[PDB]
């Protein structure tokens, strides 16, 4: 009964979970502005139209009939909520974490030492972002396995459009949401008279010291930062290593000149971002490519398709660490531009620097994709590895 969910189940989610890209190409070329008659929802595939839908707030609203987070809010309230944490997520504040993120990354590859096969996701790309986001928020990272279980549910989709699968899915997801929410409620209660140098303390101060934040928006805020904080960066690390190993010689280029890694992270955000789409609702009649959109019509904006648009990028289908002019919209565009982009850039850089120093070779054995998800990425990534001579 969620039209956006139905539209994903009718389109995106009918494609290979780790290879939606031929489908995006087909839509770009044949139906770049597509009405799903079943769901009553538009999809846009081309760079200029996706970029406009996500940024043109005069016409495209974030607020539908996580619901109580900045993600689902329009100005003026959006500006006040985002400003609570805007300063805390700046490149310069996240730079203070580079030492701690290096240590966490080191410790994980430490524990992998002496193994000829690793599960990148279980051993590395899941634990590091869950641990960093736990320490930033101010919760114990010893809960990472439960955090991962809850996060995977909160970004999941039913296995099909079939009412029984949707109901089964609603039950399990709702239970995840209840238990994660109870968790944060317990954390808040504890932190109110034991504040830390941490983001949950910042939120509590905003709710307690004035009316910047409602009591019913603390736990939503926690859920959003916990879940985004790991589901995005986990899948961006995994997807980036996969992108590198897919293109022979890329591994050795980056290892031989690690100053390229920041560019290669931007290329991984263009090429295999963890967030392939976002959604808007039309709040004012408009047109894209002469197609008329009416107030109240939902729109899915395929960032992943925009970032592969032949019209916007040369060799858009190629992973090119040397992309000189890359103006990807993989973090979004305009007022909802990813709050975590600096953290994500910093974690992914450090993750990849570590892997390229630790391993002189890595080869894919198997993967299990994130199927039935809002996210694009890997549940498992088994690799044969050879540790470098030091």
Distance CA 306, CA 313 (A): 10
283 makes contact with Ca ion (CB under 5 A): no
Return the one option of Ca ion, ligand HEM, none that residue 63 interacts with (CB less than 5 to 8 A, by type): Ca ion
Distance CA 263, CA 240 (A): 12
72 makes contact with Ca ion (CB under 5 A): yes
Q: Is 305 annotated as a binding residue?
A: no
223 makes contact with ligand HEM (CB under 6 A): no
211 makes contact with Ca ion (CB under 5 A): yes
Residue (of 364, 288, 46, 93) closest to 202 by Cα position: 93
If the CB atoms of residues 188 and 375 are measured against ligand HEM, the closer one turns out to be: 375
CB of 352 to ligand HEM, least distance (A): 13
First to last CA, the chain: 57
CB atoms within 10 A of CB 193: 7
343 makes contact with ligand HEM (CB under 6 A): yes
Count of residues in contact with ligand HEM, rule CB under 6 A = 26
Distance CA 249, CA 272 (A): 19
Q: Is 115 annotated as a binding residue?
A: no
Note whether 132 and 229 are within 8 A (CB). yes
Whole-angstrom CA distances from 85 to 107, 208, 212 are 29, 15, 11
Q: Is 222 annotated as a binding residue?
A: no
Figure out which of the listed residues 46, 120, 339, 351 binds ligand HEM, where binding follows CB under 6 A. Answer: 339
Residue (of 338, 377, 348) closest to 152 by Cα position: 377
Return the one option of Ca ion, ligand HEM, none that residue 336 interacts with (CB less than 5 to 8 A, by type): ligand HEM
| Phi/psi at 292 (5° precision) | -85, 130
CB of 160 to ligand HEM, least distance (A): 25
Figure out which of the listed residues 4, 33, 202, 269 binds ligand HEM, where binding follows CB under 6 A. Answer: 269
155 makes contact with ligand HEM (CB under 6 A): no
Which 318-337 positions form the footprint of ligand HEM (CB under 6 A)? Answer: 330-332, 336
Distance CA 105, CA 237 (A): 12
In the three-class reduction of DSSP (H, G, I as helix; E, B as strand; rest coil), residue 50 is classed as: helix
If the CB atoms of residues 63 and 160 are measured against Ca ion, the closer one turns out to be: 63
Contacts of 365 (CB under 8 A, 6+ apart): 117, 382, 383, 384
If the CB atoms of residues 70 and 244 are measured against ligand HEM, the closer one turns out to be: 70
CB of 73 to Ca ion, least distance (A): 5
CB of 301 to Ca ion, least distance (A): 17
- Characterise 197 by phi-psi region: left (phi > 0), alpha (psi -120 to 50), beta (else): beta
CB of 54 to ligand HEM, least distance (A): 5
In the three-class reduction of DSSP (H, G, I as helix; E, B as strand; rest coil), residue 303 is classed as: helix
Q: Is 333 annotated as a binding residue?
A: no
Which residue ranges are tagged as binding site for heme b? Answer: 62, 78, 82, 336, 338
Q: Summarize as ranges the residues that interact with Ca ion (CB under 5 A).
A: 63, 72-73, 211
Q: Summarize as ranges the residues that interact with ligand HEM (CB under 6 A).
A: 54, 70-71, 82, 224-225, 228-229, 232-233, 236, 269, 273-275, 278, 303, 330-332, 336, 338-340, 343-344
């Amino acid at each position: 009964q969620n039209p956006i969910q139905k539209a994903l189940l009718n389109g995106k989610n009918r494609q290979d979970p780790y290879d939606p890209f031929p489908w995006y190409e087909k839509m770009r070329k044949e139906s770049p502005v597509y009405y799903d008659e079943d769901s009553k929802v538009w999809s846009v595939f081309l760079y200029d139209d996706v970029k406009r839908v996500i940024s043109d707030k005069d016409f495209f609203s974030n607020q539908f009939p996580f619901a109580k987070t900045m993600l689902s809010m329009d100005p003026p309230k959006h500006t006040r909520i985002r400003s609570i944490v805007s300063k805390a997520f700046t490149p310069r504040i996240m730079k203070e974490w580079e030492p701690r993120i290096r240590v966490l990354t080191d410790e994980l590859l430490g524990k992998a030492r002496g193994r000829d096969e690793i599960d990148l996701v279980q051993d590395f790309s899941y634990p590091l972002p869950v641990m960093v986001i736990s320490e930033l928020l101010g919760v114990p990272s010893e809960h990472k396995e439960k955090f991962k279980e809850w996060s995977d549910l909160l970004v999941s989709l039913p296995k099909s459009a079939y009412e029984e699968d949707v109901m089964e899915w609603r039950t399990i997801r709702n239970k995840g949401e209840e238990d994660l929410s109870a968790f944060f409620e317990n954390v808040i209660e504890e932190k109110r008279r034991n504040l830390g140098d941490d983001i949950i303390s910042l939120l509590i101060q905003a709710e307690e010291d004035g009316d910047r934040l409602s009591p019913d928006e603390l736990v939503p805020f926690c859920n959003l930062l916990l879940v985004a904080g790991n589901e995005t960066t986990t899948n961006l690390i995994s997807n980036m290593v996969y992108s590198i190993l897919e293109k022979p010689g890329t591994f050795d280029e980056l290892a031989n000149q690690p100053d390229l890694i920041p560019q290669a992270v931007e290329e991984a955000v263009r090429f295999r971002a963890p967030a392939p789409f976002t959604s808007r609702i039309v709040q004012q009649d408009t047109a894209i490519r002469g197609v008329n959109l009416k107030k109240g019509e939902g729109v899915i904006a395929f960032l992943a398709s925009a970032n592969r648009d032949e019209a916007a990028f040369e060799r858009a289908h190629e992973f090119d660490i040397h992309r000189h002019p890359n103006r990807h919209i993989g973090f979004g565009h305009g007022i909802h531009f990813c709050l975590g982009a600096p953290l994500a850039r910093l974690e992914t850089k450090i993750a990849l620097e570590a892997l390229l120093k630790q391993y002189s070779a890595m080869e894919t054995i198997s993967t299990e994709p994130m199927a039935n998800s809002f996210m694009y990425g890997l549940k498992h990534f088994r690799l044969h590895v050879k540790e470098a001579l030091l």
